[PDB]
């Protein structure tokens, strides 16, 4: 029990710790800065020919 | 009249145009290339050209039609194949032996060299007829053996001159009626607007099944005559594998391929199987030809014929269902057809809603859609016919974000989605349970009570199995198996039963080419009562490990149950399941004593 | 005095044959004489066929109509164009329930037109909100998953969110065809004093399931409470602008001036949003955010603000929006802005509907914000606060104990985990699971549900009051 | 027949009429009825003659887009000369062992093409019904693509590949190791049975220019291949009409003088570029990621120039190069691209750095054709069942890495512990092949026979019984 303990709170701390808390930046990165700035882009572009 | 003022692309803007009215053909250049009215500013007329639009020259005539894109209707529309602006590829190839379409050719649609036995109706002189009727009776093929003329919809009168039984072409006069003072005289075919759907007395419920023959589709997520259907364009499954089940099998009596958006050898492909595949529920060894028309559009034809190639497709699938027959349109791509779509808005500067494509995407996908439905034929006599579209997606991204299938999953009653999981690992048809549905399951209830009573049950509980299983190997591809109960084990083994048994099928083999809906709903008793037999057993403290061991004969039989060649007859083959339900019933009490 | 009207008067109209081209979807005229910006005119095509059209730009003798149905067809030449002179009033009276629309006011159930008491204008002016008044009393379903722990008062505007090929539309049917108000009295709430009305609009709706409404509302005696107005997927994208607007129209004629209490189910909101873009589109304005114009939280917030009980009035509007969420997420913008318009949600799962649980309502996310005010001595049962409670605790707990259900075992579950599953099991498939026909009204669903809570110990039914509990759960 | 009606000589008109220059266009007044594909020929100030290609016309306006850049053009003195007929390339079977610029000018220090006729650029499409669907497998020799992806003489498959990766090499691989699994060997020299080449070298570097043209030397395959050299310090708008020139050559041989022209059109990315920039510079509406709207066609007009004939025992093999300008086949060039070509070879930046060459990876490459050129009578009967069994255990082996990852080795099952192995000794042994290695579609099979071997023949799920039993222990 001591080892099977140990290997599942490791695993958790690093869901915890790495695994979620890298998933959530790359998550933030993709839609908060790519998919805005894709978006900007279609914006500039139709009103570019919208003018 | 018309003199081409601007030429941008397949666009072409031509003055002098101030009687033009929207969509009206027109033949633009000294070739007479076909193009339609897309905008008008005064006498200035916008032109999308339906042929390569090289070589025009800022002052040569265009002379408007006056006539919409129409498609022509009547003997001879079988066993053909056109392109979007329904031009006969075969009759184009022997005009002209060159291997390429000359431009501006105008070869009739149908041919005009056949002469059809011609029988007349029941109308007779003095009947006052209307759209829709049927004047008279022509044998087009073996199979439809009464290709049954109808008087054009919008078009009524006092009829003043029938022609008798005989041999005609398709341009000589057959019926001569009188309206109003204004005398109309009829042939063997008429011209209708592919964007206006053809019109009928009222639209029913269609409420019964059309059996595709994959066992996930038939069994889970059925279709019904005149339902409207998406599946993925990804080949291996559906793709191709469900529109030759549909044009083989399947109790349509035409079918209407529409090859829209489609690659030059994949074209190639459905142009030569299709001669080459026969039907058996004619009662003879029978081309599927004879019951087709297929609308060939190669990625390179321009964007405009890719776009009309839905709807004369369409069109001539409300023009067969007019008839009382139930015909089923394929459309090989709906996405390329939105492609098209999104071009076309592109080339004429409108605002774009999302990811580029047009504002009434989803409007011009529930005008297609919409013309489905079981109907009432307009005109006498009484019949019903059915219009089963079968609308494949091509997914962008193998996510459904884009545009089309969003648009397309507000309109379709059935949605056979794709599973990349079960594509990857070459698991066909591949067919997403979690995520595909059928609305037509409540509406086949009528149909199951009097065929298959517990059909309905039956695919329930799989779905049940199938999902609770699902939610169990989501959890143990973290945890692990080992702290499961026997009957979350139990739920596992015979979810992978049903996914690898049942849901999955070949397709390219003879036992399993068409899966009988009799041989179908056996099978989903068979695999339920596999996993009922086994859960009871379990309840009555059975190990699991020990009854599966002990019980792996019934197990493979349970998966043998898929090698039943369907050809055995229904009597035979449903004896054959009783007898596996019965042994399956016997071992599980043996076994669990 | 009502004979105030004065609406004999004759106003001649003026028709133009001065087309001046045709763009898309909208006809523009070079020399109308003075133009109203949403005027409704009717265009004559050369063939003779007559098609509406309203007015979407006026510049300078210069008028831009959007027309409904399409454009094609239109020549500059013979077509002519009849300006009305007023915008789209609709055709109100108190007999107007019984009767199907099409999506632009006119009846297709073959019956008459309208006979209006007054021709009411469409989206009409917004309420005062001095004039409004909180929610107050229970708008019942019978559906026990809405009933019991996801209570609808009178005035709450609760959307159901949802995806394709749930079944939305068949709940919809089923709380068009089983809701009422829910105490007892020694009248009937059929009368003429204490009356309730259903305006049912559906936008976008498909052939096969608008054919479903009007077979279900015309065979379950549902139809004589409502008003439906159907929108095939085929019609006009302006005539799905307007029909929600024709809906909620009638439903402020009958509650604020019948003094109804009035139930609004507007089904497919998605539908309706996809036919805003169209529209936003067609003016050339740039999309917004998800291809979605900019605009639409003031478009769905005027929608949806057309509804709560009023100071003066008797009557209330109730409105349940249905809308479909695309890919099944609540970051797209039209469930995003329903829910900040809108008190709470009621949502309808998929992995309930695969496991062949109906109505697939899952009650974990589904919230009713002003559930409180609908619930308590006087407003169905002194139980009904705690019950909901109890059952929603009792419902996580299972949940949970599902989850660990394949990680510790079962027997290494606490006895309240190992009492949860058979709870979660009985609860899922026997009161959650309510027949597509199956009227439960809100005392039958409560004490379903006390018979679910029967099974648990006195200790840990530790969220429902000592007195209730003491009182409801020992006999 | 010899009938030509070359002898009608046409003056030309020329206008000294520029009235502006916008990057790569220039845009003309006062001309006589333009037509619209027209080549002109417009005359700098210094005296050098630049060719360019009318793009859009109205009434007196022409629309002009220089193909060697608009550098030093000049309205005062400029003079275009409209020659009245579209682009035509002059075409002989002797262009093979020819070098060309992108604009069909000879680089080679030989003369000008001695016309046998002047074939139009992008010429008329083939019809359907005349076309015949490939299915006869070419042996590429690289056992990622002859075993699964297999290419049949007529498919247009291209090669996806990135910044960096050598796609370059695999093409000249397949270039120099082409051929038919069962061919027809009716004669001593294969003249019939070698594979023409005609590659087209778009605004790419001259090291890999250099290195085509030595791998063609080097196996003296360049008596059989054409040159279109369109380097990167080559003008950029030239860049439209070298594939055009390479597929309107490609059909002279393959469907007039009946050969087998494989077609290598090298950076497809970099001809959507000058798409793109001509697209801006006509202030177009931009599609996605701002290439034009009309991307898709053209791209296909390009492509869709591939397959066999009714009548003529010719056929035009696609193996396209395109760039993914990121690493990302949702990029709008390969996502169009795979629209209209048959499956495609996916060269995986992962697989490079593991050293692994070709660095093919099997998940996303794909031939849409693969199943109808393989089988009994055709390769082997192992063919398709070996190939979705490798593809089914690839796939399993990435998900069973992505867990090992998470959760570790221990924790993963037999199946993932299988799945590993074989996938490492499938991408370091089956994958991994010589740059000069030329493996025998049997040889590969053989060999993956030899890696499955690793499984137990009753989790050999996707292989038919028959074939299992019969190839299995054929060891």
Redesign the interface.
Known sequence: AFIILDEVIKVTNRRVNAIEHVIIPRTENTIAYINSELDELDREEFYRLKK | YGAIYSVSGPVVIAENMIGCAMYELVKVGHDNLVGEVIRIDGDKATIQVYEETAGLTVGDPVLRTGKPLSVELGPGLMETIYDGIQRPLKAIKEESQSIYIPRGIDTPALDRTIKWQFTPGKFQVGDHISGGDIYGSVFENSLISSHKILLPPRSRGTITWIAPAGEYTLDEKILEVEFDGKKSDFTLYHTWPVRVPRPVTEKLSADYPLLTGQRVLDALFPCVQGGTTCIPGAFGCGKTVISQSLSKYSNSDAIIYVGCGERGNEMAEVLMEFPELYTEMSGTKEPIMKRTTLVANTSNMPVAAREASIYTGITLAEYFRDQGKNVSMIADSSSRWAEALREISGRLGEMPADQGFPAYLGAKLASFYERAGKAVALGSPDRTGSVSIVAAVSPAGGDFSDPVTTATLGITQVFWGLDKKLAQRKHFPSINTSVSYSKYTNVLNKFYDSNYPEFPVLRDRMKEILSNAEELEQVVQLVGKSALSDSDKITLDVATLIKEDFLQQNGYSTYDAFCPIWKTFDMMRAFISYHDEAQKAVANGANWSKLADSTGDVKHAVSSSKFFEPSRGEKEVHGEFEKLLSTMQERFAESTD | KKAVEQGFNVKPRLNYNTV??????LVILEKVKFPRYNEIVNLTL?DGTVRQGQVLEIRGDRAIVQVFEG???????KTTVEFTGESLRIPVSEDMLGRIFDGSGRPIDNGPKVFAEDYLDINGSPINPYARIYPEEMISTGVSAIDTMNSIARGQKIPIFSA???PHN?IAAQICRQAGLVRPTKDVHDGHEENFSIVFAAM?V????A?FFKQDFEENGSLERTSLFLN???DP?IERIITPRLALTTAEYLAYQTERHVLTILT?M??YA??L??????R????G????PGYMYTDLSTIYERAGRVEGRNGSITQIPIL?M??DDITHPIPDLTGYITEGQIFVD??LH???IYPPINVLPSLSRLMKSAIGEGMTRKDHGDVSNQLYAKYAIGKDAA?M??????EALSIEDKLSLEFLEKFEKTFITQGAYEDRTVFESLDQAWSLLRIYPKEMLNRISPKILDEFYDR
């Not at chain 3, 955010?289 to 979605?292: A, D, F, I, P, T």
């Open positions: 001046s081209g045709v763009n898309g979807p050369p454009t094609s067809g239109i020549d500059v030449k394709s090929g749930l068949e976008g498909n052939l096969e399931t054919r095939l997927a085929n994208t497919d998605s539908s996809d036919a873009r169209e529209v936003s589109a067609a050339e304005e740039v999309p955010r998800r291809g979605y479909t695309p890919n998929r992995q695969n496991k062949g989850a259900k394949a990680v510790v075992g079962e």
